Amino acid sequence: PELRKDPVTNRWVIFSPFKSKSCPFCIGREQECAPELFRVPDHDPNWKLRVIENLYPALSRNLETRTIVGFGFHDVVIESPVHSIQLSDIDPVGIGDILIAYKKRINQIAQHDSINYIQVFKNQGASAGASMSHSHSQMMALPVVPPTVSSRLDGTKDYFEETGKCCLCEAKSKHFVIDESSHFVSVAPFAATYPFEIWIIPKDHSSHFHHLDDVKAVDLGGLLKLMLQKIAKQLNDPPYNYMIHTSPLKVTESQLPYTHWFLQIVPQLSGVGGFEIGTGCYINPVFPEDVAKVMREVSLT
Amino acid sequence: QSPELRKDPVTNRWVIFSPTDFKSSCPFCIECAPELFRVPDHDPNWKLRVIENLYPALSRNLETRTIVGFGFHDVVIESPVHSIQLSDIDPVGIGDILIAYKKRINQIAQHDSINYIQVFKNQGASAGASMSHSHSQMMALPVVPPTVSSRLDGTKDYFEETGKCCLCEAKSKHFVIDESSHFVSVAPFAATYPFEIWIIPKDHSSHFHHLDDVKAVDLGGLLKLMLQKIAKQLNDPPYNYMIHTSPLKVTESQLPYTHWFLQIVPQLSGVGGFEIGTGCYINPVFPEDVAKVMREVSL
Ligand SMILES: [Zn+2]
Ligand SMILES: [Zn+2]
Ligand SMILES: [Zn+2]
Ligand SMILES: [Zn+2]
Numbered sequence: 001p002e003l004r005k006d007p008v009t010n011r012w013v014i015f016s017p018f019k020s021k022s023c024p025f026c027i028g029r030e031q032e033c034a035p036e037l038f039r040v041p042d043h044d045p046n047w048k049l050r051v052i053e054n055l056y057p058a059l060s061r062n063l064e065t066r067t068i069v070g071f072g073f074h075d076v077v078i079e080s081p082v083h084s085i086q087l088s089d090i091d092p093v094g095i096g097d098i099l100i101a102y103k104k105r106i107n108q109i110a111q112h113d114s115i116n117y118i119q120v121f122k123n124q125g126a127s128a129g130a131s132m133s134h135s136h137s138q139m140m141a142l143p144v145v146p147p148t149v150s151s152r153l154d155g156t157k158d159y160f161e162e163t164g165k166c167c168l169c170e171a172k173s174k175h176f177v178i179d180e181s182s183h184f185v186s187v188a189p190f191a192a193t194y195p196f197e198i199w200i201i202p203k204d205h206s207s208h209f210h211h212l213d214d215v216k217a218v219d220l221g222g223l224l225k226l227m228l229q230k231i232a233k234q235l236n237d238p239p240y241n242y243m244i245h246t247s248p249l250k251v252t253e254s255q256l257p258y259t260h261w262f263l264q265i266v267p268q269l270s271g272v273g274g275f276e277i278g279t280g281c282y283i284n285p286v287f288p289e290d291v292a293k294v295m296r297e298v299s300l301t
Numbered sequence: 302q303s304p305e306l307r308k309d310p311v312t313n314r315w316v317i318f319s320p321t322d323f324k325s326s327c328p329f330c331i332e333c334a335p336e337l338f339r340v341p342d343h344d345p346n347w348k349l350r351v352i353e354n355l356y357p358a359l360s361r362n363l364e365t366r367t368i369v370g371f372g373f374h375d376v377v378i379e380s381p382v383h384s385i386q387l388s389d390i391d392p393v394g395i396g397d398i399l400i401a402y403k404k405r406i407n408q409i410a411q412h413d414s415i416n417y418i419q420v421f422k423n424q425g426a427s428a429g430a431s432m433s434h435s436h437s438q439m440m441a442l443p444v445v446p447p448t449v450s451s452r453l454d455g456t457k458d459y460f461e462e463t464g465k466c467c468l469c470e471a472k473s474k475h476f477v478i479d480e481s482s483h484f485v486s487v488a489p490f491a492a493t494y495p496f497e498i499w500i501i502p503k504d505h506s507s508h509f510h511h512l513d514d515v516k517a518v519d520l521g522g523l524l525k526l527m528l529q530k531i532a533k534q535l536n537d538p539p540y541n542y543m544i545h546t547s548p549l550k551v552t553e554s555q556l557p558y559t560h561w562f563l564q565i566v567p568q569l570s571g572v573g574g575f576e577i578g579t580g581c582y583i584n585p586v587f588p589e590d591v592a593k594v595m596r597e598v599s600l
Contacts, residue, residue, distance in 0.1 A: 014359065058575075
């Protein structure tokens with residue numbers, strides 16, 4: 001029983017020593033969805049993925065301006081035409097299509113100086129915030145750098161000021177590797193927030209996600225595919241959340257030395273109570289040292 | 302209404318707003334872990350009692366990028382009868398619960414190894430409630446938590462601007478639901494959760510354990526004028542409530558802008574990617590609507 005901290009989260013966690021618990025997005029019904037922004041391959045009727053708006057967005061793109069009007073970009077990414085295929089089934093090259101696609105929609109938003117941050121994420125399972133079963137992802141442009149980012153800037157910075165090192169750059173000497181690819185390496189966070197949380201960090205110190213290329217998007221695809229697969233099994237196909245962390249669009253040169261984006265997967269294994277809510281502090285019932293082992297063992301025979 | 306981000310000094314961060322419509326014996330009754338004390342003292346005809354937590358998040362026996370698990374994890378058995386709920390208990394018995402907290406904060410304080418104490422309550426497994434027997438808990442910590450530190454930032458940066466404590470400015474910076482003798486309840490302007498409710502002392506106090514017997518009954522009542530409305534209007538949803546107080550060693554300097562309060566959150570929805578990735582929340586109901594439906598509710 002101890003408290004572990006990390007520059008990235010910039011907060012302490014308590015470790016105290018597990019399993020789970022057609023459609024308007026299908027090809028053809030593509031006329032029931034909100035205005036289309038683009039698809040892949042380019043406007044081809046034999047599509048593999050596409051990004052659409054959001055009928056009832058969390059932030060409106062039609063309001064571009066103690067309070068701030070709810071302007072933002074709330075977009076949806078249909079990962080496939082096939083209703084039976086999930087992100088775990090897609091071929092590594094296909095995930096790459098998704099990752100290169102996120103890059104696309106992200107590169108377009110950057111043109112709007114009003115976008116402070118952009119959160120891209122994946123919800124699989126109703127309880128984990130996913131209505132439809134059809135494979136889909138989302139994007140909510142934000143006119144405000146969020147708390148996890150502000151915390152991360154401060155954390156890694158403080159660390160960098162006192163060590164000159166980029167915490168996520170010495171990943172091999174910080175966390176617990178589950179798998180490793182050409183330009184990426186997944187890990188069990190040394191100070192992970194949730195049970196069986198996994199981070200996939202790029203190997204090159206890059207301060208932003210939309211800097212990756214096709215070759216790397218397919219390589220990161222497989223590592224992400226391998227991690228979701230070992231998760232889906234070893235943990236009895238539990239629901240999970242997927243979100244990408246990266247420096248805001250206005251990130252400063254000075255912040256660049258210690259700013260490095262990463263990918264995080266959180267399988268929904270348990271909820272929270274009054275302790276976590278009131279403090280922001282959380283409890284993890286599964287050490288990362290015991291996640292790394294089990295993870296490097298799970299098979300797919 | 303149309304989307305509208307809001308931020309409060311207390312949370313010190315923005316929240317998204319984009320919207321009546323919402324829906325929904327044991328070994329502890331008069332075998333438990335070591336007792337700290339009960340009420341009345343050593344009295345067998347007991348109402349409440351506080352015991353060690355058989356399996357502590359932070360072990361009191363550890364007392365010594367990583368820190369030792371030292372900490373106190375205690376439990377407050379709120380009732381002798383298995384079939385009772387805080388909302389029901391008379392404003393008196395609850396006061397004894399509150400006083401028990403205050404009394405507990407006092408003892409814990411003696412330890413310098415501790416920096417923050419977190420008092421809270423869970424009801425309904427779905428909200429973390431351990432067992433069905435009415436109870437609450439107190440978690441002692443060797444570190445001040447993000448919310449307190451975050452709040453310390455916002456309550457200050459806001460004070461260094463208006464020279465005032467936003468919480469003493471409750472009535473004016475929020476949506477009043479109900480007021481009692483020494484406390485008031487509102488719908489926080491930038492509330493995090495739908496139907497989230499705050500009960501704030503009207504006098505500028507910086508720490509909960511400073512509350513006295515009169516205020517404890519006045520509070521016991523308001524905390525009883527809100528919950529009965531929550532259980533009704535939302536139809537007995539699970540819920541969590543957690544008092545937010547200053548650090549064990551808050552500095553005199555931070556004192557003018559550190560005002561404690563109790564947060565009640567009715568469980569009406571879960572979280573997802575966006576939330577975990579940003580730390581920002583999406584709330585389906587403006588405190589205005591909430592403030593307008595909670596006044597109407599009749600008990
Ligand atoms: Zn579908
Ligand atoms: Zn790096
Ligand atoms: Zn009982
Ligand atoms: Zn005040």
